[PDB]
Structure 1
Amino acid sequence: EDAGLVAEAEAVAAGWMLDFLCLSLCRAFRDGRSEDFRRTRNSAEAIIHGLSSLTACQLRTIYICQFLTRIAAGKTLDAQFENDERITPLESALMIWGSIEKEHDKLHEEIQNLIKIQAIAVCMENGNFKEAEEVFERIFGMPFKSKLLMIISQKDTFHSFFQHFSYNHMMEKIKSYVNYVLSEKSSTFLMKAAAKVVESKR
């Protein structure tokens, strides 16, 4: 029994499971299925934990999943995450977004700006305006910097600016980017083989 050939087979299958789970995470994010997103992310996170070396293509996959994970927790009051990260989930997503090997196209910029604004807005929505300032000072260390600080200082959560740079607009733009990832990975081994089984059944 060649343990090296078996270990190699287990790594091939791990790469197959990673792509399958990224597709599933993207679809659950797109469809708004929170519990399926949560359970799929737990599966992907455990599979990724098994992998010790990743290719350029696999690193992109895990960072997209990390990005979608933080975005989903944008309005959540996570303490431990902030205990270690010390930053808001959206701020973390911004870091990943600006670190992924992706074309900095117009959508990239649009998504980036939305996340930035929403990082502050979400805090205002939950009533933590001090954090909103802390998030503002961390992101914006541009004649809109004095407007944004004025909005935060006046607890103007429903300013027209926040209606143009809204949570729904952030989500729609991220969801359209997800659709390109979904179209790219739709043809991966595990999902392609699985759909052929269901198509051959009925």
Structure 2
Amino acid sequence: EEEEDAGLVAEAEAVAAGWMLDFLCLSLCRAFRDGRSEDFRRTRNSAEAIIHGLSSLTACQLRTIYICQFLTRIAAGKTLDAQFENDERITPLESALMIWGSIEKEHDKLHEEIQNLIKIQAIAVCMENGNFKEAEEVFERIFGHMPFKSKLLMIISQKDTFHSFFQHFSYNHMMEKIKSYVNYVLSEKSSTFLMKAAAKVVESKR
């Protein structure tokens, strides 16, 4: 009853923390889709602290954490100063591409298009800051897609930062395709417990 009641409290705290993680993961995907940057930053901070207080995760919770990590790297894609991997040479977009190709999800046409847009922008960001040598290094770690492969290497060699290819397959196009995926994810979210109860309370005051 002493060590038993303490165990029961710990079990409930673990169920409650699991609900908090699920809610925060959904709120982060929502903030990303709506372009609410500060909300995404604050909710990411909350979700990370919550993950540190949990000792067990379901496969569904782990999968959801991976997608949220992908979104964080995409948001920091233009922050080449950001290091998400032990290898400090890995650019944020390279890290997102690694998660994108590791998540257990359908490799539908949208999946491949997002993948191909991340590869192009991984090189574009380096060129848009004049890190042309870094651009070649990223190209080697990604292109080591034949028609696009030769086109990108010729743009790195010519040093044309303001090339038309990058404008057609822009950072905004990449962001929009990624936002279309998040919407579908939220659509099939299956409704988290915390959101359902809170929404009931809100409606119960209308």
Distance 1:135 1:162 in 2: 16
Q: Is the 8 A contact 2:82 2:92 kept in 1?
A: no
CA distance 1:86–1:176, shift in 2 (3 Å)? same
Count how many residue pairs are aligned between Structure 1 and Structure 2.
202
What are the ranges of 5 or more consecutive residues in structure 1 without an aligned counterpart?
none
SS in 2 for 1:182: helix
Distance 1:31 1:81 in 2: 24
Deviation at 1:164, TM superposition (A): 2.7
CA distance 1:33–1:20, shift in 2 (3 Å)? same
Q: Is the 8 A contact 2:19 2:194 kept in 1?
A: yes
Q: TM-score, normalised by structure 1?
A: 0.94
Task: List per-residue Cα deviations over 1:128-181 (Å, max 9, x = no partner).
Answer: 111111111110111332221111111222333222321111011100000011
Q: Is the 8 A contact 2:128 2:162 kept in 1?
A: no
SS in 2 for 1:127: coil
Deviates most, 85-94 or 67-76: 85-94
Q: State whether structure 2 residue 126 is matched by structure 1 residue 114.
A: no
What are the ranges of 5 or more consecutive residues in structure 2 without an aligned counterpart?
none
Partner of 2:195: 191
CA distance 1:79–1:200, shift in 2 (3 Å)? closer
Distance 1:65 1:192 in 2: 21
Deviation at 1:80, TM superposition (A): 4.6
Partner of 2:136: 133
Q: Percent identity?
A: 100
Q: Is the 8 A contact 1:19 1:185 kept in 2?
A: no
Distance 1:181 1:45 in 2: 20
Two-structure CA RMSD over aligned residues (Å): 1.6
CA distance 1:79–1:102, shift in 2 (3 Å)? closer
Deviates most, 124-133 or 97-106: 124-133
Deviates most, 78-87 or 144-153: 78-87
